[PDB]
């Protein structure tokens, strides 16, 4: 029935002091049956990061589609796409399939290379933009993530701290969702460098 509930999966992005963070679980399932413990939901095009949750065939298709669009962008503009711009591309790309949509909940994170301002956004499957300063949540444990982020999150966290906060928000929300978990990965994004960490978590 519900395309957003077949495979499972979650993404969350948070902003900090001069930094953003994005995380996902690694589960790919077919209802009750877990199938892969290695299905990453976060991808990047230059210094703009996109996580996607939902029907895994659309997670795969959309990534291949944004890589295509961002490659043509870079050849014509002679520069990498910026988070604010990519967000508008994702938004319009989804609304284009309005009466036949991709069954996904995308999340953009990155640092504007010019201004240095941290940026995150999220979308519904037909491309409504949810632009918040604090955090963005998506997937089969979005209820749990909302409650974990609301409680745990304080503004202007240094990257080292922000890493503990997002990691704890994901792990605890995933453990209360049947269709999420099976490992997690977390990207910590600063102007200059990006660290990617795999978390130890409950394998049930």
């Amino acid at each position: 029935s519900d395309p957003s509930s077949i495979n499972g999966g979650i993404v969350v992005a948070m902003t900090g002091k001069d930094c953003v963070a994005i995380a996902c679980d690694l589960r790919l399932g077919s209802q009750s049956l877990g199938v892969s413990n290695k299905f990453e939901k976060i991808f990047h095009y230059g210094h703009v990061f996109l996580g996607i949750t939902g029907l895994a065939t659309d997670v795969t298709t959309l990534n291949e589609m944004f890589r295509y669009k961002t490659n043509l962008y870079k050849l014509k503009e002679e520069r990498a796409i910026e988070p604010e711009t990519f967000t508008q591309l994702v938004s319009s790309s989804l609304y284009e399939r309005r009466f036949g949509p991709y069954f996904v909940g995308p999340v953009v994170a990155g640092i504007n290379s010019k201004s240095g301002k941290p940026f995150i956004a999220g979308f519904d499957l037909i491309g409504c933009i949810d632009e918040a300063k604090d955090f963005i949540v998506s997937g089969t444990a979005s209820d749990q993530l909302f409650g974990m982020c609301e409680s745990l999150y304080e503004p202007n966290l240094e990257p080292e701290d922000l890493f503990e906060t997002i990691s704890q928000a994901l792990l605890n929300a995933a453990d209360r969702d049947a269709l999420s978990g099976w490992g997690a990965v977390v990207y910590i994004i600063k102007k200059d460098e990006v660290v990617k960490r795999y978390l130890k978590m409950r394998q049930d």
Binding site: D124, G127, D130, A132, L152, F163, V194, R197
Partner: protein
């Protein structure tokens, strides 16, 4: 959502709450529902949020093109006719509900559009889950020959009826004032009566609290 239009003697004001919801969940505690079709023609919507945003930008882009083509200021009845004919084509499958207010060379205007392509006109309008609460305030306090200060007060108090009595609406009040003389003025967070109280405790974790399997630097450059 709660949105209101109020006509005053020299123009028109619109106002909206700042709560966005995914079912029973508050997604954005402070999102701007107040959009511009053109400099002096503003918009506020309810219903499918992707549809209201998408339909606003399309008619906004066509209105710009039409403006340049005729070397004339955009008129409100144009944004009205275009929204109307577009929504009607799609038989209400585009879940867009809008109040449009604005000033142009012909005077000041206040209209509303529903998903099926019905239009309304009046001196005071409202729309959304907060529609009935706002309309009760408007029906009680509206008079003919409102000043600017009185119309902001009335439109602002209509949004509060929504914020307080409607679960679908809350947070702060956005207002745009369009007076026939001057530039349209947009007052983001005109009222902020729902500030979160300082938490009882800091939830900053002692460093190293989380268990990490594998680490690596990612390559962003070439």
């Amino acid at each position: 959502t709660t949105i209101v239009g109020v006509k005053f003697n020299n123009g028109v004001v619109i106002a909206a709450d700042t709560r966005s919801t995914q079912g029973p969940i508050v997604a954005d505690k402070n999102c701007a529902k107040l959009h511009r079709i053109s400099p002096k023609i503003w918009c506020a919507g309810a219903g499918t949020a992707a549809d209201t945003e998408a339909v606003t930008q399309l008619i906004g882009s066509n209105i710009e093109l039409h403006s340049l083509y005729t070397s004339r200021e955009p008129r409100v009845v144009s944004a009205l006719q275009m929204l109307k004919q577009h929504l009607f084509k799609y038989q209400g499958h585009i879940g867009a509900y809008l109040i449009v207010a604005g000033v142009d060379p012909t005077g000041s205007h206040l209209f509303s559009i529903h998903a099926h392509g019905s239009t309304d006109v009046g001196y005071y309008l409202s729309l959304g889950s907060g529609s009935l609460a706002a309309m009760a305030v408007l029906e009680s306090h509206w008079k003919q020959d409102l000043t600017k200060e009185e119309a902001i007060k009335l439109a602002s108090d209509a949004i509060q009826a929504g914020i307080w009595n409607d679960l679908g609406s809350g947070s702060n009040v956005d207002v745009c004032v369009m007076e026939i003389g001057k530039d349209a003025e947009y007052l983001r967070n005109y009222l902020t009566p729902n500030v979160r109280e300082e938490k009882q405790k800091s939830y900053k974790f002692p460093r190293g609290t989380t268990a990490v399997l594998k680490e690596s630097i990612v390559n962003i450059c070439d």
